[PDB]
Amino acid sequence: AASGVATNTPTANDEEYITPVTIGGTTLNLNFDTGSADLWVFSTELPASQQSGHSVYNPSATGKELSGYTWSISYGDGSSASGNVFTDSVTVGGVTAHGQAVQAAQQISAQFQQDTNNDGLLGLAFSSINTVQPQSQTTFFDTVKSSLAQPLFAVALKHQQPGVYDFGFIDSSKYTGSLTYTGVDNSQGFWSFNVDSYTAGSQSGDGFSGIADTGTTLLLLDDSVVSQYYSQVSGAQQDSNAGGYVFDCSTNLPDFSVSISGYTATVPGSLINYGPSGDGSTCLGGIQSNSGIGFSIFGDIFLKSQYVVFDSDGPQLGFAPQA
Amino acid sequence: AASGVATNTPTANDEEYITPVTIGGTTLNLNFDTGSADLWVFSTELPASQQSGHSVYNPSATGKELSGYTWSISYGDGSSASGNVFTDSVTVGGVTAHGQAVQAAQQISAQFQQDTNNDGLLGLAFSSINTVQPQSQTTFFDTVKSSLAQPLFAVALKHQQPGVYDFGFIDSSKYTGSLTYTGVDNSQGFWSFNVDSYTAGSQSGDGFSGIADTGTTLLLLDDSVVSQYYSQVSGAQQDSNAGGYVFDCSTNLPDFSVSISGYTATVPGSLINYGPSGDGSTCLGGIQSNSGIGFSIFGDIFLKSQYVVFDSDGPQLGFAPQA
Ligand SMILES: COC(=O)[C@H](Cc1ccccc1)OP(=O)([O-])[C@@H]1Cc2ccc3cccc(c3c2)CC(=O)N[C@@H](C(C)C)C(=O)N1
Ligand SMILES: COC(=O)[C@H](Cc1ccccc1)OP(=O)([O-])[C@@H]1Cc2ccc3cccc(c3c2)CC(=O)N[C@@H](C(C)C)C(=O)N1
Ligand SMILES: *[C@H]1O[C@H](CO)[C@@H](O)[C@H](O)[C@@H]1O
Ligand SMILES: *[C@H]1O[C@H](CO)[C@@H](O)[C@H](O)[C@@H]1O
Ligand SMILES: *[C@H]1O[C@H](CO)[C@@H](O)[C@H](O)[C@@H]1O
Ligand SMILES: *[C@H]1O[C@H](CO)[C@@H](O)[C@H](O)[C@@H]1O
């Protein structure tokens, strides 16, 4: 049975986490994203000037073209990318997917043309939301899952330290105590789960649903919860230059917790300070608005406090505090 | 119980079929497409110069905006469109969907900027492939289906004559004999079905699968079947100016048939002559290549010969020769 461990590393301010992935013998640094289902990479099909500063996939050398197939994806921040499709070998943490669909970029929006930290994204949401047309393809995890020792992957993202993505097995040394599981609703293709309640500092509130999403940097919540939280932070103020609420870097931030099937997942206040706002000398808060979409995004700020198991059997999510 | 009849009308050469749809009190001419699941329309959000020659939806007057939601779609021919989303009333053939998601265009590719024949497309494929993010929306048919007398719609497209889309009931006067049903595989979101064999003129062959697709003008088949068919047409030749095989307009074209669950669906040769090629004085053939995608597209050329029932119970497709 297969299993493997891929090491991830945060970029500045933990804005994103990269992990090396070898495709057709070329290694590229990808952003693993449990919030989408496409594996796409910068390629030789892009104009030369856009290839600069990136490791790029050359489909002609090793890939098998799927004639007539295309892909196009748009993310929550408005960025987008599109291209054609080839099958090729893809290795992550020593685990190899033969015949994995690789989406070669032909066009990318400005956000991507600016970020030299990654060479593409590897989707780990459910395959039902893969964008390939006319027939969608399976994510790397769905392609290999029947070969793994257990059909699951687990993640430990950390603050300014290397972390891991465990494929096919659980590393019990990565968390304290036992894991608590909760059911997943995959109807919209996400790893969605319910929380029974929350506690933002000195105020508690009713439950809501949200998605476990490694691809999103912040913890995005309802406007009402955001207001409740920052009402407790002395001097907090919105600053559109920074992208949301900011406050003096020395501020004592309250914790934020959610109850999930009897388990209390706590994000300590220190993790909620995302870092310098890059506008004056204030810091940006890890908690910000979800723009009214109706559900919460449990991004990197939250994930840094927990070891999370994504189990296809159920499906279900397991949580415990990182050790 | 509800039911209704919407009248469709072909544009020049039956290139596409339009049907009026009222949205928030404004009537727009849309292309009904069983091959996709998005209802999108030209809107006031487009630059003014792109609105010219179209009836356009004004979301500010009557729609409820879904904050943070967006859509982006790319079709087989490479054309694309994207925008935001509002809910509003949508009426088709006297049947009204309250709260239907309407995708307002913000950007459209050149193909759309050129076609003044339609103001958008109304998708009738399965909702699982609707492109709205972060959570997909239901097609007009899925929105109203529980209210219809029977959860199905049926279509009769015709050559240079008005046709119909029956919602919620079957008009037995539209076909000869009884309907023959076959099972549908909706796993990729299409109305996909299997044929046991085919007969192209004097040559027969093994079966394959394909999709019933009102949105595609031609009958797109495997390259091998296309070659077999045109080998029988005297003088047939490929002409990239016309887009495929062309031949003298006076030519006698052989019939094309497929066997579906014991029923023989026959497309008479006269329907296979699509019309003038718009290159010299040859005519373009109704049968052309599917570019190697692995399944066939039963487009308008095929549908003109049959009355087709799209039944959500099963799901299943029913066929009989048009009367
Ligand atoms: C296609 O679905 C995604 O975009 C899914 C789910 C979704 C969909 C629509 C709206 C909101 C959320 O997010 P994701 O794949 O994790 C997606 C991954 C992603 C892709 C491009 C990015 C470019 C710049 C910065 C970020 C990016 C993140 C940081 C960031 O957190 N961005 C968020 C927005 C929300 C602040 C974001 O777009 N994240
Ligand atoms: C998003 O899925 C569609 O495009 C589905 C299925 C599909 C997907 C990918 C590849 C092939 C087929 O096709 P459709 O919705 O019926 C889609 C509807 C559509 C949309 C825009 C068009 C613009 C110009 C001309 C046509 C258009 C047809 C005539 C035409 O037959 N075009 C074909 C290509 C195939 C000749 C077409 O794009 N048709
Ligand atoms: C992950 O688990 C597999 C299967 O037990 C091992 O073979 C591998 O070395 C790693 O421990
Ligand atoms: C990735 O790399 C780290 C150290 O660089 C290891 O701890 C991990 O097991 C994986 O090999
Ligand atoms: C379609 O069917 C409905 C339900 O029987 C009728 O009410 C309607 O007039 C049309 O015949
Ligand atoms: C649409 O219009 C035609 C005639 O224009 C009718 O036959 C059809 O029933 C529907 O009303």
Short mmCIF file of C-alpha atoms in Angstrom, two decimals, chain A residues 67-76 128 131-137 187-188 190 290-295, chain B residues 67-76 128 131-137 187-188 190 290-295:
data_model
loop_
_atom_site.label_atom_id
_atom_site.label_comp_id
_atom_site.label_asym_id
_atom_site.label_seq_id
_atom_site.Cartn_x
_atom_site.Cartn_y
_atom_site.Cartn_z
CA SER A 67 -7.73 16.49 -27.99
CA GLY A 68 -10.69 18.86 -27.76
CA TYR A 69 -10.50 19.19 -23.94
CA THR A 70 -10.12 22.54 -22.20
CA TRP A 71 -10.35 24.01 -18.71
CA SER A 72 -11.12 27.46 -17.26
CA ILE A 73 -11.34 28.38 -13.61
CA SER A 74 -12.15 31.53 -11.61
CA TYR A 75 -11.37 31.89 -7.93
CA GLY A 76 -13.06 33.79 -5.11
CA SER A 128 -17.26 16.81 -8.95
CA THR A 131 -13.54 22.35 -14.50
CA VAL A 132 -12.26 20.22 -17.39
CA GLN A 133 -14.66 20.10 -20.40
CA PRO A 134 -16.30 18.22 -21.93
CA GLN A 135 -15.76 15.64 -19.20
CA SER A 136 -14.31 16.49 -15.82
CA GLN A 137 -11.17 14.77 -14.51
CA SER A 187 -22.89 18.36 -2.28
CA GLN A 188 -21.19 21.55 -3.54
CA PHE A 190 -16.21 21.23 -0.77
CA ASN A 290 -16.89 36.62 3.84
CA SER A 291 -18.71 39.27 1.73
CA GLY A 292 -22.09 37.81 2.54
CA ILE A 293 -21.77 34.47 0.75
CA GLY A 294 -23.70 32.59 3.45
CA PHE A 295 -21.06 30.21 4.86
CA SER B 67 -23.35 39.07 -3.19
CA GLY B 68 -19.99 37.41 -3.82
CA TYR B 69 -21.35 35.01 -6.49
CA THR B 70 -19.92 34.85 -10.01
CA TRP B 71 -20.11 32.65 -13.09
CA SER B 72 -17.80 31.91 -16.04
CA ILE B 73 -18.44 29.48 -18.85
CA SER B 74 -16.53 28.28 -21.93
CA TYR B 75 -18.18 26.39 -24.77
CA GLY B 76 -16.91 23.73 -27.16
CA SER B 128 -24.68 19.54 -11.57
CA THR B 131 -20.94 27.18 -13.34
CA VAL B 132 -22.09 29.56 -10.58
CA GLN B 133 -19.55 29.91 -7.71
CA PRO B 134 -19.28 29.39 -4.84
CA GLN B 135 -22.44 27.31 -4.99
CA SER B 136 -24.04 26.21 -8.23
CA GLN B 137 -27.64 27.10 -9.07
CA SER B 187 -22.74 11.44 -14.60
CA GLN B 188 -21.08 14.21 -16.65
CA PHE B 190 -25.40 15.71 -20.08
CA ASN B 290 -16.07 15.61 -33.18
CA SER B 291 -12.31 16.39 -32.97
CA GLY B 292 -11.58 13.16 -31.18
CA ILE B 293 -13.41 13.84 -27.90
CA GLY B 294 -14.58 10.22 -27.55
CA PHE B 295 -18.38 10.55 -27.83
#
